[PDB]
Structures are given as structure tokens and as C-alpha cells.
Design a protein around this ligand. Sequence first.
Ligand SMILES: [Br-]
Ligand SMILES: [Br-]
Ligand SMILES: [Br-]
Ligand SMILES: [Ca+2]
Ligand SMILES: [Ca+2]
Ligand SMILES: [Ca+2]
Ligand SMILES: [Cl-]
Ligand SMILES: [Cl-]
Ligand SMILES: [Cl-]
Ligand SMILES: [Cl-]
Length: 673
Amino acid sequence: AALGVQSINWQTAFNRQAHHTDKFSSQELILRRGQNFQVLMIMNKGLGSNERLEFIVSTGPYPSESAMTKAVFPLSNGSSGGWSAVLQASNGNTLTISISSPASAPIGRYTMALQIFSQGGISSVKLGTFILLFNPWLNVDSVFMGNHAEREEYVQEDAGIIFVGSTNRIGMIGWNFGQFEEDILSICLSILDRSLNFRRDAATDVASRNDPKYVGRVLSAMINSNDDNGVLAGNWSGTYTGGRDPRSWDGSVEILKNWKKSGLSPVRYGQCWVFAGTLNTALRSLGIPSRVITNFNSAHDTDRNLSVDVYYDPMGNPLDKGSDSVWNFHVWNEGWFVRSDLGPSYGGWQVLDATPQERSQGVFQCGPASVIGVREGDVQLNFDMPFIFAEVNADRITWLYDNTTGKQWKNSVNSHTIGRYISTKAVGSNARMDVTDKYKYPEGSDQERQVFQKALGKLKPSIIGKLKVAGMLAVGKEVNLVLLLKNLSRDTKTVTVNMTAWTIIYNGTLVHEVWKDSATMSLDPEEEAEHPIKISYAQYERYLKSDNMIRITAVCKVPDESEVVVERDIILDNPTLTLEVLNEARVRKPVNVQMLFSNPLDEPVRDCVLMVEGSGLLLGNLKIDVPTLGPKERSRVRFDILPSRSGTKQLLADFSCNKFPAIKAMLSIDVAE
Ligand SMILES: [Br-]
Ligand SMILES: [Br-]
Ligand SMILES: [Br-]
Ligand SMILES: [Ca+2]
Ligand SMILES: [Ca+2]
Ligand SMILES: [Ca+2]
Ligand SMILES: [Cl-]
Ligand SMILES: [Cl-]
Ligand SMILES: [Cl-]
Ligand SMILES: [Cl-]
């Protein structure tokens, strides 16, 4: 009889554990390139000295041998670089074979077939399929990361921390990456097959999937719905009807599944941190080390001149007159891999930004831009460096503009306000790691100034005031501020002060005026004076968005002297929302929990909905309609979860009602067994 395969044992458990891919929920064979995996092949008979077995693996719609998208290797006794199969042992009709792929093979879904040379003929049989990923464990992979604690953080951790807020107050929100949850690895893998790149040339695209630079750049474009039927639809208008408030999401799992579920239709709606969270899920899942970055006072330079303009009018109103803009904070990603296109000194952390801000080559893509390449001002390298350098170190010019005259005049120039407290989640804890010293030399140092000009080169007052917050700021309470002025001149002057308060979206989008007042006064030389600003709930609640932010502005003008702009954005807290466990948590055993919320308003809160999720704690997102809560009343929603994996797990919740959109809550649970 002719030689044939009776059956094949992929030893999925073993290989996956050895390939550090066992955390995935899938049942498939998940492997990482450049590493060996052993399989058992029971043949109908014993192997002959004159018989031969050729293994055939292929990926994508055009398996090409010369494109590395297809490979055919013989079963030998020795080993050959790249794909190869080695007969380690032969017992009975069972063959113990060790297969190995090349560290430079393309990632993605594969198909394995067998070609058998026996008794004068040749047969072929499909053997199965397995998924192939990047290998941060392999010293020769592009994505190699030597440190254990680090790799675990940037590849294996499915729970995260994203810093938000403003330079006056840094906060954080929990985010569920859920890269190991069901269908998540598959959906990400399917993204690469939906990109514009693939549609433009599937053959060349699948062949380029052996490069993290390519894969990351493709994801930076595909995670946003712009241009390619991507995943997320952005919206910074402050009104998200027909979708979900950008601040209500808690993870990437429901965003990616909804995407696949709605026939790859835009998921509405998202903002920078949502994009970053999803993009970061796509990366850690494919095997590319990654973390999320928050840059406070992020600038958006449009005319590539390393300068951003912000306008105001004589009345003290913020103005949306410039194509450029300064966000209170912007969140993006950093992938880890060697840049063989830039040179040995530019490998390491690379920047990837899926937020649709600037087009690159016509489409909304961004990265990779070596972070090392950014600090030295080498903006001539790919990709999108002039733009990225501008987010972290552009100069802020403040303009005065009176529309009644069409006149416009520079007010000042700040070369240190932009790019501050650049944070990322610490390794193995929730501590805030500041990586600013990584994106630039110290503000206020000659080097920072020297590099700025280097980069630019490649692309080419009697009164002083400060606004002081008084008492806590929380949605429902009144806001109290204090304009502090002082006359530093030897002369007694008369100063006119125009103040305004506008609710805003963190990106700077002005929403609506909630307060205004004027005040003329005479200050003597060295005399200090303070003006009280008071804004009731009634006034701002009407136009306050889920950002809970207000832009306070005071424009002080003294006769014949230039104007003086005193500015300060404030963040109003949400009435606390608490999470609590009602017993000790153990794997596969129910764990009782409860949500707690007190409504501080004199009016009830209706349309209450609770959202809970957490990788390893629940499967998906738990939705709960909450009964309307009266004024000063307390809500106590009970529910259970069933821990599926042990360790420090993250429980995230979202509480939304008519007077309080997206209140967040987070609890770190320790699951035993
Ligand atoms: Br290199
Ligand atoms: Br303050
Ligand atoms: Br604040
Ligand atoms: Ca897109
Ligand atoms: Ca500019
Ligand atoms: Ca600077
Ligand atoms: Cl290893
Ligand atoms: Cl999957
Ligand atoms: Cl770092
Ligand atoms: Cl946590």
C-alpha cells in the first residue's frame, strides 16, 4: 500500500504553552514565528528509505514561495534555516516531527499540507491550519524584548491604565484591552485583510505582514473608520446622538466585536484614548509589544512650522479661528521593534497614532516614528515626524483678534507649555510613569532649543494675573475661582478685565458660554487685587459635556499697554461611583458584587444604565437598566461575576443617566486558584 497520513496530533496545549500563546481563548493552534513546535503524525505504515514527505504551509490569497507567503520543506534529520521539519523520533507508524518557521515569516493565518512521495507516485493532503504571530521572546525577531517583566506588561497584560485630564490635574481611566477574549485575535487578524493596502494588492500586502513597521502602520489607519471602513468613527462635537458617548466605553472588546458584528460598519463614537486602546489591543494580540501614551497639552500643527496658534478676542472669549489646535491631552500608542529602515540607533519604542488628525500619504495613518528619532529632532525620517514632533514640542503663539476690525495681533509665545507630563502606565502597577524625558531634552535647556531649530531647519506688561480654583470642583456644585492681579509697575494704572467661561471638549472644541463679567479698576504700584468668579450649576449644567471641563479666560487691558491673557481650564469631578466585592474571589466560583451611587442633585437622575466588564472576570459587557434615582437618594445594584482566570484582575464599570453621562468606576480584584 501507498504511504498516507492516518491522523495528526498538533499537541496544541504543549506548543501553545511553549509559544506563550495559551492565554488566548481560541481553540486553534496559535504559534509565534521563528520557534519550533512538535507534532505527532501517525502514518498508515512505516517510513521507507525511498519515500519522502514534503511539508507545505501557505498564507494569504496568493501563497508565493518567493514572497515568503508559501513554503515547502522536506522532513529531514537535520535542520535548515527558515521553514523546516525534522524527524526527531519514529515509533510504530507515529512520526515525532519538529517543525520550525523563520523569524522573518509573515504573521497571520496559515494552512498546512503534506506531499507524500511513495511507491512511484505522489499524493497530497491538507493537514490543518494554525495562526502565526510575532515573537517578542525570540532574540532575532524584529519585536524582541529581552526583559521578562516588561514583555509581560507590554504583550501579556490584558488590563490597562490610560492617563487623562489636564496639566493642572492628571487623572486616569481603566481600559479593558481584552486581547485574549473570544474572537478578538481573529478579528484583529481579519483587519489586515480589510485594509486599503490589502485591497490595493493582497499579494504584496500579505507578504509585508512579516514587518511590524508595516503591520503597525496599517493598523494606525484601520482602527479609525476614515478612508477604509475602519473600526472607529471619531466625534469631538460634544453631541453623540446615534452612537455612544466617547467616554462611556471601558474596553476594546465590545468595540471590535460590534465592528465585526455590524458588517464592518463604523463603531460610533470614539476619541483619542478609545482609538489608542483598540489599536493597543490589535498590537498586543498580534505579538507587537505596546503601551499607551498620554501627552498633555498636545499640539496639532497643520502648516508644518512647529508652531500652533490660539486666538482670543478683546472680550476674553476663546476663539476657534485657527486650523491648528492645542488639546488638553492626546493619547496614542508606542510599538516596540527595530527600525531596519532607519538604522540601529533608531530602534526601540516607535510611535503609532490611530486618531484621525493628520493625513499621511492622503489617508489618516500615522507612524512608526522612532521616539529616539523625535527627541533629537530628526524629522526627516519616516513616518510623520514633523507632525509628531509638533505634538510634543511645537511653540504656542497666542493671538488677539477683534473681528469688528479684522485686525489681529500677537500676544505672546510659549516654548515650554506644549508637551508635558507625557505619561504611560508603569510596568506591573498602576503608577504613572513619566516618559517626557524620552520625547525631548528638558524644557528650559539650550538643547531643547537647539533641537527645535534643528527640526524647524529641516522643514525650511504692567499687570500679572493667575486664576485660582477655590474649593472642590464637581458636577452639581457651584464653581468658584479667583482672578489674581498685581501691578508690577512703578505707576498707578487703570485696568479693564473681560472674563468668560466656556464649556469645552478636551480637544479644545469650544461648546458654549456659561458665564461672563467685566471689571475696571485702578491698581497702585505693587498693589495686589483679586476678583471672585462664581458660576452656579444651573448656568453651566445646561452646556457641560461629559468632559466636565470649562475654559476660564480673563483678558486684562491697561491703557496703551498690550493685553494680558490669563487662562485656566478646569475639571469638574463626577459624584463618585463605587464598586465592591461581597466575598473572596476564586476561579470558576461566583463572586457577588454591587454598584453604589448617590445622586447629589436636587433633581432625580433618570435613564440609568450600568455597564460592567473585565477580562477574566466576566464574558463581555454586563448591561443593567437602573431604576430612576431620586434627589439625594442612593442606588445599590447587585450582580455576580464568575472569575475564569486567576490573578490581579480589573473590574470596570460605567454609570450613565440624564444628568451624568459616563461616570466611571474601577476595582482591582485578586482571583485565587
Ligand atoms: Br537595524
Ligand atoms: Br489653582
Ligand atoms: Br482643575
Ligand atoms: Ca481609516
Ligand atoms: Ca502652525
Ligand atoms: Ca518647547
Ligand atoms: Cl523561547
Ligand atoms: Cl479568536
Ligand atoms: Cl520608557
Ligand atoms: Cl485596576
